[model samples]
Target: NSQLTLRALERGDLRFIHNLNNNRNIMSYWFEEPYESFDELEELYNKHIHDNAERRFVVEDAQKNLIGLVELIEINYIHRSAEFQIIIAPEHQGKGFARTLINRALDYSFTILNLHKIYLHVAVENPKAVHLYEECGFVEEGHLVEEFFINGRYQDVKRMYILQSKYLN
Candidate 1:
């Protein structure tokens, strides 16, 4: 069984995000440095508190335990699109929670926000995530060679997208 919920990321959640941000394995997937100081994260959270171009949600469960984070950033109202990103802690990885988190975020994007499309850039080596995205209605749109440098190596990235029409239908 799978059950997940999402809530608007708040000031109190910065600590959790700070810890998650420091996890090397998790940050590797995000193509970001793993050692962000809590102060920097807090500064960033404060800076983005009212930014319309971004939306961050803290994923939880029926019991209200934090499971992960889901974010949609770089929202372009004129274009009606945004970039999607997610992170699930290692301890919660095998429970099919990612799917629920994804669909719920997608519903918010397409239905609530009325975005026409949502996209994400995922590391090429993550075949399982790629397959899962496919199951969630995203299709590979492009493959960029050496799109990012991660853990001292260049990594290929695949751009995938889904349209509201397709997701809703």
Candidate 2:
């Protein structure tokens, strides 16, 4: 839908992502940890900016407010597969933004990019996100035991995916 847009992430967007990354409450259930400094984030931005295997995007609302982020990480062109990741600001979480953002991403992944399958590893700690992935057509592919070590403990993750054949139809 035209109401939502995904733009190539820019240098200025680092603060938004950095702030999101630093939130203990937000990062607790997820696997990523907080950034210790702005320079570190800038270094990360540089890495992604030059990396061909990742497509980072900023999801904006109709009025151009950055509401969230959705990314196709670890993209492998030859295999036509990638890892899907998203982060919705606390205020935006639970308001259908994730649905819209993900549908747009799936559309791009399946239709534009012709990716065979896009998958994600969701922490078992985030039940709501795992449920959301299923609603968007990502079927459970496997259970990963202690796949991620975050916030002092090893955590389990559920791997889910949606094939182009399944989503494009």
Candidate 3:
């Protein structure tokens, strides 16, 4: 397995993140369109990283290349829950980095953030992601038909949740 680290998204990392965020293949399933411009991307990044405490780190390899991003979104302290979001570069998709990132994020969520549950939404077509989440102890909680629209078609999304009780076990 490779060593991948998650660090807070810094000002210097915006360009790298913008590149991945705008990559059509990577964004096709996750986002509706590419960023309008670098300025727009910078604006979004600033708002997300600087203004939001719920966000986590950007994924990087040992060599320090920016490869992916993940975050804990919609944190609910009252409910002790949060949603995890991730997107890895197409070239790095099958390298086990996703699993590493998930494990690290879950550790932070439970041990550090003290969250009781973590959940995420994945496209039904993304079997790889679903498999990865399941392997990490997430259970399929529900499915939404035609939940997202992309590439001129509607797609279903599967909801998955992992409780801290399961993670502890």
Clash statistics: count for each candidate? 0, 0, 0
Task: List runs of model 3 lying over 4 Å from the truth.
Answer: 24-35, 47-53
CA displacement after TM-score superposition, residue 128 of candidate 2 (Å): 3.0
Indicate which candidate wins on TM-score: 1
Query: All models: lDDT?
Result: 0.83, 0.80, 0.77
- As a TM-score, model 1 comes out at 0.91
Local error of candidate 2 at residue 28 (angstroms): 12
lDDT by residue (60-158, candidate 2, tens digit) is 888888788877877899999999888887777777777888898888889888899999999999999899889989889999999777778899999
Candidate 3 per-residue lDDT, tens place, 1-169, comes to 3578888767787666667757743342112124656786666665555443366578888798777888787787889998888878888877767778889889888888899999999999989879989999999999989987766788999999998988877
Better-scoring candidate (lDDT), 1 or 2: 1
TM per candidate comes to 0.91, 0.87, 0.84
Candidate 1 backbone collisions, by pair: none
Evaluate residue 6 in candidate 1 and report its C-alpha lDDT on the 0 to 100 scale: 81
Worst 10 residues of 1 by lDDT: 26-35
Regions of candidate 2 where Cα sits further than 4 Å from its true position: 24-35
